[PDB]
């Protein structure tokens, strides 16, 4: 059934098409009559569904494009590991990681920018990075710079291999459509073979290399004194001196006597109190169990043999009573459309990035991550933003499916039809609950603000005036703190210490994630988060559902996914397109993730992070001013924005001065974006035609006719400059704030 259907030499390797730009499209492969052409050359560059009509060439194009992306990421990791090897203080950071700033970038002394090379620590002048690569490397048992250079060279090798792979799998031997459509084998392999064997091999590294090395690094051993990792593979006596279960080898394994493996495959949940990260002993067992699970999960789908679930046979089996035929047809609209799959995988990968952000602060998995408050904050914020962007792109590509790849005649689905038929009910109830949440989450902030301004602090919604305690979250918190016991024995402690009954993991002078107390401010801000998420889903789901038709435009699909409008008629029908809906959902994702990372930064700096002296008195970075000031907007303006932006603006003449520079610059780029979002094309075309008169007066009339940006392009430029500016403002503000007071 499944096979390796692949055809040779379909496309010629030649620069002939490089010389002819815009070759991929018909209207673009004839010349730039205008300047918009170049914007259409980049816009449609990766719109392979519009270049061709057959799915075979599209699948080959995106396959080799994924290979290019993997080449890029291998080259990026090459850069990171190399810069760690040569331009870093990692060899010194291992000695005193609680006081040396992790730095992996040095600037060139030319124009005074050598101030950026600051006193990170370790006898090294550079930039205090906030990526957490140093923490990984301590978790990977690197203990050198040679290993990092070798890793960089190997990553460069794999980058070149992936580049050759894309070239081979497009130009030399490109797979045909029967190969991609065999999703059964693809899932069987990516579950068991990528995620199963990948987690298994990382468990092997974690058992053989990370665990024995971190058993010494945490035990006051200098990295120069540690035995090399391969010495544990060659000499098992040195490995057994700390974990004697290796003296028996795999006889405990194959005889199912796993009870004599707990020296290195543990379940003692919680954070290693010597470094603040999770127990690597638990992470080895984790990735091992995940290997078992993905290995049994990747033998689920029939590929060639009589066993396995045909995914058609799973989907067609589910047919609801008043839900109609049910999931029949979905295997044909997911295997004959890349955009549907792209949307699904984007949505899940984005929510997974967010879950990563959430589980990487509350269960610090790397050593000296929780105490590197810059790394923790930056990683949470990063992955939150990536998740929001991926979800918003999932919306865009659901819409693109609905416009292009949706065919109720051939590739019919029942549930999608049922969703389209009461789409007004969906959007009406979402448009209601967004207003309800908006009111009962932000009008509460307004109420607190007014009551505090009228001198009525006894009337706010605070932890002192009117109790809005998260009773449900408090119950989950208290039962997860008292989870070690009847419900989860053999764990020795809670799976995390972000719950009230937990304890404080004092690492050096720092505090590293004691319990998080949930009060009225957490209720208010969590409902603000639900609000912003619900409005984003309103906008995006509305764009997806009404991508094809509305009461306003019933032929919206014929106009396309990415179109500005259908004229000033009907009172005006700007931004009816799903592209414009996702362009608005970008702003709302921005507001959502911005208030999310603000909640994170403030709740952490006030209720979690800080410094605990040897007497035991923990003093937080702000001073616990979240539950009292995060109930009103003036606190976010005063105690969070105004106050914590006293280290990014005062950082002029310091090592953190590029942060204030990009603070002002990202401010600027955001505001500059407002020139695009607010304005319209017609003014700029008329202005351009005036200055084109000024040029034609001097025989400087360019043949590529100067055209103002297309409307959808003005909206794209506006949203990208707006997001870049707000996000770089926040990035600079967070990084300078959290590196300065640290």
């Amino acid at each position: 059934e499944v096979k390796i259907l692949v055809d040779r030499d379909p496309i010629k390797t030649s620069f002939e098409e490089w010389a002819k730009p815009g070759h991929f499209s018909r209207t673009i492969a004839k010349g730039p009559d205008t300047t918009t052409w170049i914007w259409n050359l980049h816009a449609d560059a990766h719109d392979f569904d519009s270049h061709t009509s057959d799915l075979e060439e599209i699948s080959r194009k995106v396959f080799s494009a994924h290979f290019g992306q993997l080449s890029i990421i291998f080259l990026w990791l090459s850069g990171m590991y190399f810069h760690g090897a040569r331009f870093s203080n990692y060899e010194a950071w291992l000695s005193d990681p609680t006081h040396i700033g992790p730095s992996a970038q040095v600037v060139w002394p030319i124009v005074g920018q050598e101030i950026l090379n600051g006193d990170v620590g370790g006898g090294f002048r550079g930039i205090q990075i906030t990526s957490g690569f140093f923490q990984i490397w301590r978790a990977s048992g690197i203990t050198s710079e040679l290993q990092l250079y070798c890793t960089a060279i190997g990553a460069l090798v794999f980058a070149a291999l992936m580049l050759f792979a894309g070239w081979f799998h497009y130009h030399k031997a490109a797979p045909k459509l029967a190969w991609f459509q065999d999703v059964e084998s693809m899932l069987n392999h990516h579950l068991a073979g990528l995620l199963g064997l990948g987690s298994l091999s990382w468990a092997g590294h974690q058992v053989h290399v990370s665990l024995p090395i971190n058993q010494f690094l945490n035990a006051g051993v200098d990295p120069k004194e540690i035995p090399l990792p391969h010495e544990f593979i060659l000499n098992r006596d040195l490995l057994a001196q700390l974990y004697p279960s290796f003296a028996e080898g795999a006889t405990p394994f194959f005889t199912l006597n796993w009870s004599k493996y707990s020296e290195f495959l543990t379940f003692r949940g919680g954070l290693d109190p010597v470094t603040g990260g999770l127990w690597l002993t638990d992470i080895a067992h984790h990735h091992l169990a995940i290997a078992i699970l993905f290995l049994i999960a990747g033998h689920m789908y029939r590929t060639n043999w009589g066993i396995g679930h045909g995914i058609k046979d799973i989907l067609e089996a589910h047919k609801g009573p008043f839900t109609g035929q049910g999931h029949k047809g979905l295997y044909e609209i997911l295997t004959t459309s890349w955009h549907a799959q792209l949307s699904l995988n984007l949505a899940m990968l984005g929510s997974l990035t967010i879950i990563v952000a959430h589980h990487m602060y509350s269960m610090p998995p790397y050593p000296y991550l929780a105490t590197d408050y810059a790394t923790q904050l930056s990683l949470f914020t990063h992955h939150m933003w990536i998740g929001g962007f991926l979800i918003v792109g999932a919306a865009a590509h659901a819409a693109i499916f609905m416009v292009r790849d949706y065919d109720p005649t051939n590739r019919y689905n029942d549930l999608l039809d049922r969703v389209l038929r009461h789409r007004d009910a969906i959007i009406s109830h979402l448009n209601w609950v967004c207003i309800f949440l908006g009111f009962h989450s932000f009008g509460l902030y307004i109420h607190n603000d007014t009551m505090s301004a009228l001198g009525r602090p006894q009337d706010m919604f605070s932890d002192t005036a009117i109790q809005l305690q998260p009773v449900f979250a408090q119950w989950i918190q208290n039962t997860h703190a008292l989870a070690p016991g009847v419900t989860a024995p053999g764990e020795t402690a809670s799976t995390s210490l972000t719950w009230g009954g937990g304890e404080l993991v004092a690492v050096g002078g720092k505090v590293a994630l004691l319990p998080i107390p949930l009060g009225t401010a957490d209720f208010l801000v969590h409902h603000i988060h639900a609000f912003t998420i619900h409005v984003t889903v309103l906008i995006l789901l509305k764009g997806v559902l009404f991508a094809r038709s509305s009461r306003l435009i019933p032929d919206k699909a014929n106009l396309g996914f990415r179109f500005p409008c259908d004229g000033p008629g009907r009172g005006g029908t700007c931004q009816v397109s799903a592209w414009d809906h996702v362009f608005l959902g970008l702003f709302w994702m921005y507001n959502a993730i911005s208030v999310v990372i603000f909640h994170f930064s403030w709740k952490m700096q006030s209720d979690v992070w800080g410094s605990i002296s040897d007497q035991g008195v923990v003093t937080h970075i702000t001073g616990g001013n979240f539950a009292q000031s995060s109930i009103t907007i003036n606190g976010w303006l005063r105690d969070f924005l105004w106050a914590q932006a006293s280290q990014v603006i005062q950082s002029y003449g310091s090592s953190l001065s590029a942060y204030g520079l990009f603070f002002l610059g990202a401010h600027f780029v955001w505001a500059f974006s407002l020139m695009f979002l607010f304005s319209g094309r017609g003014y700029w075309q008329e202005l351009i035609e005036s200055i084109v008169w000024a040029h034609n007066k001097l025989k400087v009339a360019p043949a590529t006719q100067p055209r103002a940006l297309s409307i959808i392009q003005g909206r794209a430029v506006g949203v990208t400059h707006y997001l870049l500016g707000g996000i770089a403002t926040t990035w600079a503000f967070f990084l300078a704030r959290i590196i300065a007071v640290g």
Binding site: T255, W258, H299, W305, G306, I307
Partner: protein
């Protein structure tokens, strides 16, 4: 694995139980009167190993 013990006997019994459930009333081509392929016996023995390890460690932790 020190054959004749409880873990080994339990494992062999579970593996043979799953192989029997496969050969007679299911749950690498025609080489058996019942159409039992190499992949079918591989599958049945692997899930037999799964249940065997599960029940072995479940008797170890509580009981045996």
């Amino acid at each position: 694995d020190f054959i004749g013990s409880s873990t080994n006997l339990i494992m062999v019994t579970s593996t043979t139980l799953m192989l029997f459930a496969g050969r007679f009333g299911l749950a690498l081509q025609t080489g058996d009167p019942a159409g039992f392929t190499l992949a079918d016996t591989l599958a049945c023995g692997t899930v037999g190993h799964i249940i065997g390890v599960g029940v072995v460690l479940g008797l170890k932790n509580i009981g045996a």
